[PDB]
């Protein structure tokens, strides 16, 4: 399959026994489920992301479906408004993001697909996150006046500045559109961007 991102990522998995909705997410480390019972040894650990940590238990060796491609790996289970496919179980499923071209990178997954973007003159390092609706970037100054507006992650919920109309260069493909600008942990590029430049993901 190749999955567009002008919509949420989302594919059924199966973990447990049971059928669940999942989020397609390069932007996560780790694999994210809603509260569900795994028997097995756990262990406490505490993620983070935009609005901070939530506490989690986490399951070893735990077999999970997507798309009816079979992965086996560690499960974090807690409050999660969504749950997540992190990196650690698309690579097993070898899921790239792919900026369609005869130029056009293929990204895997083994790593954060970090990449420099150009945004306000600045070189930054950001995330390629298919798990976030908008682009979020650290304070910086952008022309224009901003709406505020908050966003929620996972964490909690933050303030962010709107800037519409923005260009940005990621990679070297240019895109024009609306950033964020507040105290996200990472920079991401989010799938309002991503659409712009052509990325899809694929399995
Ligand atoms: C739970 C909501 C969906 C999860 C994604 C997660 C993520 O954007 O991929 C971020 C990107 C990096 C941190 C900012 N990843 C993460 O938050 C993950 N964090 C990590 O991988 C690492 N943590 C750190 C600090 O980097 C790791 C060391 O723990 C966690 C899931 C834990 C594995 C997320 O936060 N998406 C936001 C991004 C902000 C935005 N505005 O786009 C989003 O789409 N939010 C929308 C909608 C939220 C979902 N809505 C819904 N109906 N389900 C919004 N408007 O509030």
């Given amino acids: 399959p190749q999955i567009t991102l002008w919509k949420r990522p989302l594919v059924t998995i199966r973990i447990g026994g049971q059928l669940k909705e999942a989020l397609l997410d390069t ?12 028997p097995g040894c756990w262990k406490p650990k505490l993620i983070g992301g935009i609005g901070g940590f939530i506490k989690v238990r986490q399951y070893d060796q735990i077999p999970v479906e997507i798309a009816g491609h079979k992965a086996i790996g560690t499960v974090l289970v807690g409050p999660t408004p969504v749950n997540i496919i992190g990196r650690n179980l698309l690579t097993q499923i070898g899921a790239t993001l792919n900026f369609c071209g005869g130029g056009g990178p ?10 420099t973007i150009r945004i306000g003159g600045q070189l930054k390092e950001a995330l390629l996150d298919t798990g976030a609706d908008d682009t979020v970037i650290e304070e910086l100054n952008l022309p224009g006046c901003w709406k505020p507006k908050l966003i929620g992650g996972x964490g909690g919920f933050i303030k962010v500045r709107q800037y519409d109309q923005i260009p940005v260069e990621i990679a070297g493909h240019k895109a024009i559109g609306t950033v964020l ?9 989010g799938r309002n961007l991503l659409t712009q430049i052509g990325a899809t993901l694929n399995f």
Avoid: M, S, Y
């Fill in 181 to 189: 600008v507040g105290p996200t942990p990472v920079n991401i590029i």
């Fill in 106 to 115: 293929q990204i895997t997954l083994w790593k954060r697909p970090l990449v």
């Fill in 27 to 38: 932007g996560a480390d780790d694999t994210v489920i809603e509260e569900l019972n795994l």
